[PDB]
């Protein structure tokens, strides 16, 4: 869509919207695209804010080179120009940082000596701009997260800023803050000659002191005159602007001067008491770029905007609640929705295999671990996990794998090993139970009935972090079971009538992905045990209507399942042929 | 060579080396599984005769004598300057090879895995080297998959190392594997290393993504668009007030969002600039948005403690009055009549500002904007316009929001390309010289 | 399909046979379902052979002499519930002299070069058990003293002679109708 | 050693007395804001009682400070919060926690 | 025409999907026959069942949950590998076990349970970890042997069940003879208890089994304790620690109920 364009697109998720398609593509025997959906389709649209991302190797104009770093020199990150003096060549600003941020103190405090480096804060990192590079067209300093400006002409003084003023109750100004995105300084107001230089490069030192928030800038060895105090807390990424008048346009040298720390040291917490300077392969050169898409949300808020009279105004009203699951990433001070990662392969790879560690590390009842994961992963993230339909079909499966594990997995386990025996007290309630219900030779439904035979206790500690015992440790985290049974039942019920459809809309988007987790936590709470009568009696409806009618819809049992389905179908039948087998138990003990 | 004989006098056999690593390689290479069973079969038996008779020969010491000697150099620069250039052009390869040889004479073995153990701490030692790190690793997964006394002896140190592996060289999914690895074999959970794994892991919330449920927050504005500029026929000093008539403190897990405040726009575009059009996002969540929540002052996603005569987040009955100065840039708020501690200032004025309100569910509120539009509870501060006075002549005022998709229908969903700059916002006449 | 995985598991490389109840049962119903049992007219004796015939086809047409000759190599001559199947088995597809049952079973031996099979042969010919004076003697002194036997069987004396017959039976089966090639093969 | 501020006020007037179990809700973040604990996602009220260790000491005293129906931000300096030990698997060593809580009822 | 039973459903079911597709998944094939025959073989589970079924009157309701609740603990922690918080919950464990009624009243149940098979398998586990690097958790072992002979102490039936395990107590006989105050608590006095007074079980007792301990004795006599040597004893050439426990087991094997057994 170009300028002040609007424009529509329709599907066909509901035929008779569609216009022409009966005057032409119904006859041709063309398919509206939505046919075989249940849910809407997930619009992607080009995304208006640039981001910050890795330098692509296959990129026509930006090179970037790692130099490893000698006994004699430090590791540096060179930036060329691939296509300079070439035609089509594009010659404007390009904005560059670096990958991880250095994260000033939480409170501020009111030859090289190595104790000062063991208790110091202070990190230095350098930029030489390359001789025949014109240095006004450089900037050298920090930016936060927060920088999305991409201006064709960028200068000092259309920064983002702000200075919030605290005053006491009279007015006095007891404090002023200054805050900003953009922390930089540019290299042709830096040079003390000016010009053009060839003795050497310019080389323009950044100096952050992370204890007391003060950043300074050395130019050639002196002191300028530029300075800049942050906030507590600020995440700071090295970042140079520059626009290409060279074959090599800059580096990131990441030497170290006297009294101070490498970057490095900073960025790295492994390498926190490391006074020699390193360049770890995760440190890399980012620039900004709008090759980037955006999912729009499937749902928004319903927002209702009248107005109520003259007098009164306009009234916005908002009353339903809507909630969305967000990834963030550490090292980038960025969070996204998480079911973006249906196109972010690695995060969604990377994501999947650490909820698989997740459930390795509480697997076999390691009840404290599970306690302490309750924390990272808490039971409205798991709900919303198990019941969205556009989650991927991978983290789908490992949220219900998790779930299953820290709550559920342990009791399970134990009443699955305690399945075999059958040690049955003799009371009335014993002895009430027989082989039939009446009078006629007709089996009631599995599970249905009276069961005395003894059943180990299940029993759940509350996870709170606030209290100070040790007993919470013994039993695994309390989730609410009600809930849980209910959501899966409602969830089943919903699946088996969309498979019948044989729709191209799975959740998770297959029907394996569909099935297998959802199964697989049924089969959990089945044989744990907190389904009763009329849950057994619908959940046993859905499996198979026509034999197990109370006293012709296709079940689970039959509808062209895969061999993963099949094998917890089999799995469930083993179950309640096991169901039989203690009832049938019970009642010859009942005679006896 | 590390003696330092003479190069030329040394006789390095740098090809047939690499040709018999390959040649290796590929008798070790194991069935591939489109074979039918009984094949697959009868050829992982040959590989499993061949990896016990290289075992008891003993060459995977030799492997190791190798792999120790080749990392004497720390680089292929520095192995060409000792040896030949040539020698150093395939160090790198030669290390490779020699790591892959390692894992297939190992994987599927378990006595192989098992007579590993004694040399499996003389492997992690060099995990960090960016020339070994890979084949280390699948080296350490086949050891740890095969061979339980493995995980006996993988101790404290080893992994912390593993995991600082994360932390130096990133996100990778093998290390995951290889930490998942080490806490179950076979069936059987190892604490120890579970406990480790954890404590050494979690706490940090520094390396693995974090996951947290959000509440959306929309936004809503009316439709005036007021500026400041050199020669502009436009008033600087603006007013509005707004009153909540129902707030819900929770009405989920998270807290209710709801900040009223001033908001600017990148250039002369309409469009709200510097933050997301949907998400969690409200404002004072940029530096392009000012807010207030009854409590604090938000800019850029950072919040100040505001001081207030009975100062409270902001709930039923409240209303507050923003005030606006372009001249000196500034903006006030004032809570049911009393001043607020706090002020911005100094901001940027080359953008349009105007009112808007974020929000989460469970809000009820109402804009005062002057005259017919709704009737201030206050007197505005002398100076300060109300904000209807701002509406160009044929436009009617309208709170609509601030971003340019709702909730509706998929179909029935207007999708908007870019639009046009809005320079009428601000009439500099401009007539010719003469 | 079923024996197919049998024969597949058999196949499987693996240090020890391991004691599979599946296999264990359903070996036994596929033995039984063969011969599936005062003057007899030769037409009603002639028809059992023919219904013999048919039922041992229904098996050895998918692959049970493969399988039965794969479970006794995979083996490696260690006495077992699983030989004892496999025997009993191999005996009810091969009662009568089957002719078609024998070609097969020489055929895939001389195919795939099982030496496995006859050396599982040997060592459960050495691992079968004999008359123990000893144990007898023991168990003749325990019923004296007047205690009764914690188990009823008391088979220590002569271990498995169903198992020796079974294993016997099998080889003379194999050798029946005077099968000159398989007689020259063992 | 803890701080508090009021983010809603209470009635003001009654206060956890010796003994008395206090009906609190709760969520805990860390200095950088993350969340660590919430009893509104459990949806579980949280009950301790004044004076029997039961609780950080920084929470104690919080809950000591606060009034009945009123809602306030608990920022607890380490020694009062898990020391240096901190918690294993959640709470870093050295970390500062920041809790709002409410005190729904005393009883 | 409808099922009307859940065993028709899924024999029918089971079929129904074999004959629809060739299955390409082993534990789908398995899963599936195994379920046919189950079906199929309605006695079986019945077979299988009743045996490892107990009933037991309102009494001991609590005391039998609370039994079963430890039994539990003890089953999962086969799941885990040695640790000494495991050690410090299976020796609790075990405490409880003696503690309760149930496990003297009822040792039919507890040897339907198959509490001393999971106690015997803990054991194997303890002495297989590091079994050349000397045994480790020597509490663990000595707490595991005294629960057994207790067991063998307990019932004539339960002594059997036990003497059934045999061979494998004297592979392990030469666990910790040499260390004392392990006196009575290592696998040789398990294996001991297996045997003591039962006459039926001595003449069950084969030769094997005793030349296995008289191969032992003869290396104690030949070659001398290197543990002992380690810790500063004086090298004198055999093994009279060791010897002697061998010995004492003979002397149980060959001597019953004050007769002498001459076999």
């Known amino acids: 869509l170009g300028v002040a ?139 936060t997260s927060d920088f999305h400006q991409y201006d064709t002409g960028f200068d000092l003084d259309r920064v983002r800023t702000v200075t919030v003023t605290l005053g006491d109750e009279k007015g006095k100004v007891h404090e002023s803050i200054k805050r900003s995105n953009c922390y930089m300084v540019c290299a042709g107001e830096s040079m003390s000659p000016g010009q053009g230089r060839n003795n050497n490069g310019l080389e323009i030192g950044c100096v952050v002191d992370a204890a007391s928030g003060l950043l300074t800038f050395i130019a050639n060895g002196k002191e300028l005159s530029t300075y800049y105090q942050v906030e507590p807390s600020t995440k700071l990424f090295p970042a140079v602007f520059a626009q290409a008048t060279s074959p090599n346009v800059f580096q990131f040298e990441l030497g170290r001067i006297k009294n101070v720390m490498p970057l490095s040291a900073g960025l790295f917490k492994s390498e926190h008491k490391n006074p020699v300077p390193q360049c770890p392969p995760r440190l890399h050169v980012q620039f900004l770029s709008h090759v980037l898409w955006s999912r729009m949300p499937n749902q928004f808020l319903k927002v209702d905007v009248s107005r109520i009279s003259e007098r009164q105004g306009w009234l916005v009203q908002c009353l339903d609640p809507l909630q969305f699951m967000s990834l963030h990433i550490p090292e980038e001070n960025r969070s996204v929705d998480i079911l973006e990662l249906t196109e972010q392969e690695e995060l969604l790879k990377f994501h999947y295999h650490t909820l698989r560690l997740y459930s390795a590390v509480c697997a076999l009842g390691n009840h404290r671990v599970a306690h302490a994961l309750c924390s990272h992963v808490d039971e409205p993230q798991l709900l919303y996990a198990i019941e969205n339909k556009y989650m991927p079909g991978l983290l789908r499966a490992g949220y219900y794998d998790l779930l299953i594990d820290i709550h559920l997995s342990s009791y399970a386990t134990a009443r699955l090993m305690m399945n075999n025996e059958y040690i049955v007290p003799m009371t009335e309630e014993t002895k009430s139970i027989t082989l039939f219900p009446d009078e006629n030779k007709k089996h009631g439904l599995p599970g249905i009935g009276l069961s005395t035979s003894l059943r180990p206790r299940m029993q759940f500690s509350s996870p709170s972090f606030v209290s100070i015992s040790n007993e919470c440790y013994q039993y695994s985290p309390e989730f609410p079971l009600d809930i849980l049974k209910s959501k899966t039942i409602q969830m089943l019920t919903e699946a088996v009538k969309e498979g019948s459809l044989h729709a191209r809309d799975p959740v998770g988007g297959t029907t394996e992905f569909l099935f297998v987790p959802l199964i697989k936590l049924f089969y959990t709470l089945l044989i744990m045990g907190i389904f009763h009568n009329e849950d057994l009696k619908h959940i046993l409806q859905l499996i198979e209507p026509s034999v197990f009618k109370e006293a012709p819809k296709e079940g689970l049992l039959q509808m062209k399942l895969p061999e993963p389905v099949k094998l917890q179908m089999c799995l469930l039948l083993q179950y309640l042929c096991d169901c039989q087998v203690r009832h049938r138990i019970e009642a010859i003990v009942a005679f006896s | 060579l590390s003696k330092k004989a003479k190069a030329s006098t040394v006789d390095l056999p740098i090809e047939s080396v690499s040709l018999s690593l390959q040649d290796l390689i590929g008798y070790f290479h194991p069935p591939d599984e489109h074979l039918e069973h009984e094949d697959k079969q009868n050829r992982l038996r040959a590989l499993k005769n061949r990896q016990n008779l290289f075992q008891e020969e003993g060459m995977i010491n030799l492997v190791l004598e190798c792999i120790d000697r080749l990392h004497v150099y720390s680089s292929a620069a520095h192995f060409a300057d000792v040896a030949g250039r040539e020698a150093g052009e395939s160090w790198k390869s030669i290390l490779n090879s020699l790591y892959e040889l390692l894992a297939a004479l190992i994987r599927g073995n378990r006595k192989n895995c098992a007579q590993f153990s004694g040399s499996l701490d003389w492997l992690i030692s060099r995990l960090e080297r960016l020339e070994a790190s890979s084949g280390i690793l699948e080296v350490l997964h086949c050891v740890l998959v095969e061979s339980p006394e493995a995980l006996n002896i993988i101790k404290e140190g080893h992994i912390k190392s593993i995991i600082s592996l994360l932390d130096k060289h990133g996100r990778n999914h093998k290390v995951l594997d290889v930490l998942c690895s080490l806490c179950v074999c076979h069936g059987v959970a190892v604490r120890s290393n ?102 604090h002052l938000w800019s850029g996603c950072i919040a100040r403690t505001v001081s207030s005569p009975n100062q409270h987040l902001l709930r039923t009955d409240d209303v507050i009055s923003c005030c606006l100065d372009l001249s000196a840039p500034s903006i006030s708020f004032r809570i049911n009549g009393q001043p607020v501690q706090g002020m911005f200032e100094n901001f940027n004025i080359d953008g349009l500002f105007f009112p808007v309100v974020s929000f989460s569910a469970g809000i009820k509120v109402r804009f005062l904007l002057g005259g017919r539009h709704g009737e201030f509870k206050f007197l505005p501060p002398p100076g300060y316009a109300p904000c209807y006075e701002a509406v160009l002549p044929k436009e009617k005022l309208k709170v609509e929001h601030s971003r340019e998709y709702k909730q509706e229908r998929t179909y029935t969903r207007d999708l908007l390309g870019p639009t046009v700059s809005l320079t009428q916002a601000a009439f500099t006449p401009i007539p010719v010289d003469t | 399909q079923l024996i197919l995985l049998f024969s597949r598991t058999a196949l499987t490389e693996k240090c020890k046979l391991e004691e599979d109840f599946l296999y264990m049962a359903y070996a036994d119903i596929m033995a039984k379902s063969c011969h599936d049992e005062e003057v007899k007219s030769f037409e009603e004796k002639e028809m059992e052979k023919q219904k013999l015939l048919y039922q041992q086809a229904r098996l050895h047409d998918r692959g049970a002499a493969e399988m039965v000759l794969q479970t006794i190599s995979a083996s490696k001559g260690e006495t077992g519930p699983m030989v004892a199947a496999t025997l009993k088995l191999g005996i009810a597809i091969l009662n009568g002299g089957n002719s078609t049952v024998q070609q097969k079973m020489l055929d895939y031996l001389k195919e795939k070069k099982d030496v496995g099979f006859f050396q599982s042969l040997a060592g459960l010919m050495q691992s079968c058990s004999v008359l123990d004076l000893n144990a007898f003697e023991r168990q003749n002194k325990a019923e004296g003293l007047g205690m009764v036997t914690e188990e009823g069987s008391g088979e220590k004396v002569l271990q498995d002679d169903e198992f020796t017959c079974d294993l016997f039976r099998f080889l003379q089966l194999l050798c029946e109708g005077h099968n000159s090639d398989f007689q020259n093969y063992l | 050693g803890v701080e508090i501020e009021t983010i809603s006020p209470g009635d003001g007037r009654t206060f956890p007395k010796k003994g008395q179990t206090c009906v609190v809700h709760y969520t805990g973040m860390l200095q950088n804001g993350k969340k660590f604990d919430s009893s509104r996602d459990r949806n579980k009220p949280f009950k301790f009682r004044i004076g029997k ?33 901190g918690h294993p698997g959640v709470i870093p060593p050295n970390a500062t926690l920041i809790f709002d809580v409410e005190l729904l009822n005393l009883e | 025409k409808k099922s009307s039973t859940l065993q028709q459903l899924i024999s029918e079911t089971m079929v129904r999907w074999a004959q629809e597709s060739v299955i390409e998944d082993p534990e789908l094939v398995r899963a599936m026959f195994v379920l046919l025959h189950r079906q199929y073989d309605g006695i079986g589970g019945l077979v299988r069942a009743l045996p490892k079924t107990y009933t037991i009157n309102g009494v001991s309701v609590e005391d039998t949950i609370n039994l079963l609740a430890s039994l539990g603990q003890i089953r999962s922690l086969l799941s885990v590998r040695m640790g000494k918080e495991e050690e410090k919950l299976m020796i609790r464990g075990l405490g409880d076990i003696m503690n309760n009624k149930v496990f003297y009243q009822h040792p039919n149940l507890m040897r339907a349970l198959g509490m001393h098979e999971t106690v015997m398998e803990v054991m194997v586990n303890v002495l297989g970890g ?134």
């Open chain 1, 5 to 143: 364009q609007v424009g529509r697109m329709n599907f066909g998720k509901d035929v008779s919207t569609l216009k022409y398609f009966t005057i032409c593509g119904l006859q041709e025997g063309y398919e509206p695209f939505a046919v075989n959906t249940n849910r809407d389709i997930t619009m992607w649209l080009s995304k208006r804010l640039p981001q910050f991302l890795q330098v692509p190797s296959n990129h026509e104009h930006i090179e970037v080179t790692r130099i490893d770093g000698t006994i004699d020199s430090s590791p540096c990150l060179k930036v060329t120009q691939k296509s300079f003096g070439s035609q089509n060549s594009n010659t404007d600003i390009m904005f560059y940082r670096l990958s991880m941020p250095i994260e000033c103190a939480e409170v501020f405090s009111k030859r090289d000596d190595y104790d000062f480096l063991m208790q110091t804060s202070t990190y230095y990192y350098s930029v030489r701009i390359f001789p025949g590079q014109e240095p006004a067209n450089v900037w050298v300093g920090w930016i």
């Open chain 2, 194 to 295: 579970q406990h480790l794994i954890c404590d050494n892991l979690l706490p940090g919330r520094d390396l693995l993504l974090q996951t947290r449920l959000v509440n959306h927050v929309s936004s809503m504005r009316p439709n005036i668009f007021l500026g400041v500029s050199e020669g502009s026929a436009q008033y600087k000093k603006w007013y509005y007030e707004l009153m909540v008539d129902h707030t819900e403190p929770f009405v989920t897990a998270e807290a209710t969002h709801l900040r009223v405040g001033w908001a600017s726009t990148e250039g002369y575009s309409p469009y709200p600039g510097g933050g997301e059009e949907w998400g969690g996002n409200g404002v004072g969540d940029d530096l392009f948005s000012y807010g207030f929540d009854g409590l």
């Open chain 4, 53 to 85: 260790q039961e609780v950080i000491k920084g929470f104690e005293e919080g809950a000591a400070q606060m009034s009945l129906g009123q809602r306030a931000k608990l920022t607890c300096t380490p020694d009062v919060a898990y020391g240096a030990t």
């Open chain 5, 130 to 263: 590091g079994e050349s690097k000397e045994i480790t958790f020597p509490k663990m072992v000595a707490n595991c042997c005294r629960f057994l002979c207790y067991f063998c102490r307990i019932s004539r039936q339960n002594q059997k069940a036990m003497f059934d395990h045999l061979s494998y107590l004297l592979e392990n006989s030469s666990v910790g003879l040499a260390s004392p105050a392990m006196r009575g608590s290592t696998p040789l006095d398990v294996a001991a208890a297996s045997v003591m007074d039962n006459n039926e079980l001595a003449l069950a007792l084969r030769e094997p089994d005793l030349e296995k301990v008289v191969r032992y004795l003869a290396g104690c006599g030949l070659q001398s304790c290197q543990m002992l040597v380690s810790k500063g004893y004086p090298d004198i050439g055999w093994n009279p620690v060791e010897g002697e426990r061998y010995l004492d087991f003979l002397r149980f094997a060959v001597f019953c109920n004050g007769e002498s057994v001459e076999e």
